[PDB]
Design goal:
Chain A: This is Reverse transcriptase/ribonuclease H. Chain A: It comes from Human immunodeficiency virus type 1 group M subtype B (isolate BH10) (HIV-1). Chain A: Heterodimer of p66 RT and p51 RT (RT p66/p51). Heterodimerization of RT is essential for DNA polymerase activity. The overall folding of the subdomains is similar in p66 RT and p51 RT but the spatial arrangements of the subdomains are dramatically different. Chain A: It is found in: Virion. 2 copies of one chain form a homodimer. Chain A is built from 12 helices and 20 strands. Helices cover 29% and strands 19% of the residues of chain A. Chain A starts with 26 loop residues before the first helix and ends in a 5-residue tail after the last strand. In chain A, a hairpin with a 2-residue loop joins strand 12 and strand 13. The radius of gyration of chain A is 33 Å and the shape is elongated. The longest helix of chain A has 19 residues. In chain A, helix 6 packs across helix 7. The first copy, chain A, is of the alpha+beta class. At the A-B interface, helix 3, strand 7, helix 8, helix 9 and strand 18 of A face helix 5, helix 8 and helix 9 of B. Bound molecules: the ligand N#Cc1ccc2c(Oc3ccccc3OCCn3ccc(=S)[nH]c3=O)cccc2c1. The ligand N#Cc1ccc2c(Oc3ccccc3OCCn3ccc(=S)[nH]c3=O)cccc2c1 binds next to strand 4, strand 7, strand 8 and strand 9 of chain A.
Chain lengths: 527, 388
């Protein structure tokens, strides 16, 4: 408390301190509030202030959780708005996969920490609250916060900085002990045997006590397994908390949102979770009371998902010496399940790469994006890119890489043999074919060097051109050379979408999946 | 004595977020920053300072170095500085025979910095798996890579380079963001000797090879077989270049196509003078393009494949100021080296460093530019690409 230094805090430039009027309260509320405030003043958390200070933040009395007693909550929206923006506390929880196995791990939750770390003298004035007096006889009793208030914008950042400053000398003196910190709690882990570990944790508690932060007793400390942010941290395995899917017959939009969230959360350890059809249902904006029927495809998806969730799965903590290995599998169209395992059949983390909504791309391009996403998440969690294992053949990758127009790279990878195998369905040639029927199209007919012609009744109202490009394929034969008036059709065909999202692309692909040589060129519109 | 440094009126400082980095890079950054703090160049900051600026570690040599991405703070200050304190650009550097970049980034680690401006230069070293909050820092000495550093150190640089420039009037020296450009029309060996002399000069005063003449604009070329496909290709390219050059017309060649025909054929109507003459209309470089001092340079990189990359620097579209063809290893590496060469040529020709329309995708460049970067400056690249 006393040794903990004060961080300079000031209001935003050009803004005055909060000034709010307190509304009258009930007689039991005011008596409970004055009792609690007097107890705090005895403890020194708050100090009475004179009438010269015009800053006031309203107070509200709420029944304590499962308690008839009326705890005190002070609103801080105004002062939060009028405060210098502090550095945000890190919003990403540590992933249990990146943790390294240690012989003993203890959970130390610092008690009443925001009331232990003090506050700046200049800023103490604005954090003033008034406890009203009945019958309007007196203005009331005023108080101010000598210590970090709760609900304030800067409480997490200031407390985190103070905790780091306090813990630094202990980390310097003992380097083996690793101390994670998330929210208030301190998570301590050492490779020492339990006999020395209990002594070291007692030493840490004494250090925090001499710096004024209370810690739980030895008996009260939790014992494994630990439940933390939906993760069940066993000694040698980590699993997600038991996930039960709703059996509700009629699903509302909010129910679908919860189901998709639970399935996505379960995907991190459970392999083979598919949520794409449910997300397709969810894309239509609707009221939370709106009831959307379950398509047969979505019902199949939910059936296979609930079948997958029936089995239990576990993950394994990271061991630094061995190298990470990541494997991608294409479960279906637009779904790619990726697994990250140091050793075979011991998965650190499973996941899925959902296809971009409303995007049709070549499966090799989707594979490249999945590889990039794996690289990013691996960097964030472990700090090293994995050695990938991908379905695509090296020759197919080289062909698409050299022909494609962007810059695409993939880290070190090898070829694992498994169905399905991702390959370019049609390799358009970039040179013409002699002795083949030269072919002209227009948005739809076939105008030919042989002399055949045709006409399509264009709707009075470009698809007919795509129809013509399709109509070109079946009319010509095995060896075809076509030219196109518009660049759009050439771009669509050159992107080589094996996605087969639309019916016209479907028929084009079905036609040219067997044609041995099809060369398309673009000839400008002739004036 | 500290000089007053002020942000442009009504603008807040940097608040950008750090992109997560590899464990080896984090370790190298931590050790470098700890050593610098012990020397006194950087000092710790608490949570009262929201401002942030990314940190990346590059390797130039087995010693890691730190590149601090000061693009936003530069946007907010160098504009204020350029009018207040500027660096002129010698026009003779482009005509010099040999030009050398000698890094003088160690000067700015001595002279102090304004107390009020110290807070806007804050950087964090990230941690793996969110184990601990990053060790935040601030710069107490002049930053490296911030365009106000040469402006502040200009007086010292002039007083340190005056004797050498007086001794050698032919040498042209120009400074841009921790880089000194030394140009000499002398032969290459004499240039090496002069650069060694300048390095010894700087070292004794407590201060610690591209060829511009060879560069020239790229010619553009535009059918004895008269293959109908080649005639279609020529009419397409001529219709494309119609915007760039007003002279070229493809009407007669269009008549040569004459509609429906078979693809492979062996024919010239009114001869083919048009092909030759339009080749002439192209051989002469574009006319009517002049540098505009108050506009941004944007460079488009186009991937022609086969280890080839064509770039076009242009103030206004369809009026190129310079066209080239870089010829080269992964595609990300090729793009990195292409960007570096393009902007170094831009620096030696005109003052500015171009904005880039990179062909690569956003997250891939974000992930893989740091490994292959080897230059102190950082251009304002645009990840998104226009399909070429
Ligand atoms: N509730 C809660 C809770 C408890 C401990 C956590 C945690 O502990 C470590 C702390 C420091 C180093 C390694 C750690 O963990 C290694 C792996 N590990 C994990 C568990 C067990 S019982 N044993 C073991 O070795 C790190 C992060 C979050 C934590 C949350």
């Amino acid at each position: 408390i006393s040794p903990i230094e004060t961080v300079p805090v000031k209001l935003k430039p050009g803004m005055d301190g909060p000034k709010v009027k307190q509304w009258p309260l009930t007689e039991e509320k005011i008596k409970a509030l004055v009792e609690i405030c007097t107890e705090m003043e005895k403890e020194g958390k708050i100090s009475k202030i004179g009438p010269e200070n015009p800053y006031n933040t309203p107070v509200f009395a709420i029944k304590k959780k499962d308690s008839t007693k009326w705890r005190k909550l002070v609103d801080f929206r105004e002062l939060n708005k009028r405060t210098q923006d502090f550095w945000e506390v890190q919003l990403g929880i540590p992933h249990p996969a990146g943790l390294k196995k240690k012989k003993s791990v203890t959970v130390l939750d610092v008690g009443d920490a925001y009331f232990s770390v003090p506050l700046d003298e200049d800023f103490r004035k604005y954090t003033a609250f008034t406890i009203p007096s009945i019958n309007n006889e007196t203005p009331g009793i005023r108080y101010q916060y000598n210590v970090l208030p709760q609900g304030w914008k800067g409480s997490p950042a200031i407390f985190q900085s103070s905790m780091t400053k306090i813990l630094e000398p202990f980390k310097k003196q003992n380097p083996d002990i690793v101390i994670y910190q998330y929210m208030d709690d301190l998570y301590v882990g050492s490779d020492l045997e339990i006999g020395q570990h209990r002594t070291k944790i007692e030493e840490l508690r004494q250090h925090l006590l001499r710096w004024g932060l209370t810690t739980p007793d030895k008996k009260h400390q939790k014992e494994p397994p630990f439940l933390w942010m939906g993760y069940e941290l066993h000694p040698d395995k980590w699993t997600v908390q038991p996930i039960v899917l709703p059996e509700k017959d009629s699903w509302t939009v909010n129910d679908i949102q919860k189901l998709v969230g639970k399935l996505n959360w379960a995907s991190q350890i459970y392999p083979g979770i598919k949520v794409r059809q449910l997300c397709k249902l969810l894309r239509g904006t609707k009221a939370l009371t709106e009831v959307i029927p379950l398509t047969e495809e979505a019902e199949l998806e939910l059936a296979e998902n609930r079948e997958i969730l029936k089995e239990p799965v576990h993950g394994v903590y990271y061991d630094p010496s061995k190298d990470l290995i990541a494997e991608i599998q294409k479960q279906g169209q637009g779904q790619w399940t990726y697994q990250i395992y140091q050793e075979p059949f011991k998965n650190l983390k499973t996941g899925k790469y959902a296809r971009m909504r409303g995007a049709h791309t070549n499966d090799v391009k989707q594979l490249t994006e999945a590889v990039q996403k794996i690289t990013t998440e691996s960097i964030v969690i472990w700090g090293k890119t994995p050695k990938f294992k991908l379905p695509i053949q090296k020759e197919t990758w080289e062909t698409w890489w050299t022909e494609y127009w962007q810059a695409t790279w993939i880290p070190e990878w090898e070829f694992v043999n498994t169905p399905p195998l991702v390959k370019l369905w049609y390799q358009l040639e970039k040179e013409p074919i002699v002795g083949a029927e030269t072919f002209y199209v227009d948005g739809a007919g076939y105008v030919t060097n042989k002399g055949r012609q045709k006409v399509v009744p264009l709707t009075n109202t470009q698809k007919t051109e795509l129809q013509a490009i399709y109509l070109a394929l079946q009319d010509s034969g095995l060896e075809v050379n076509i030219v196109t008036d518009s660049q759009y059709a050439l771009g669509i065909i050159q992107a080589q979408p094996d996605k087969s999202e639309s019916e016209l692309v479907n028929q084009i692909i079905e036609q040219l999946i067997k044609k041995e040589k099809v060369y398309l060129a673009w000839v400008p519109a002739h004036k």
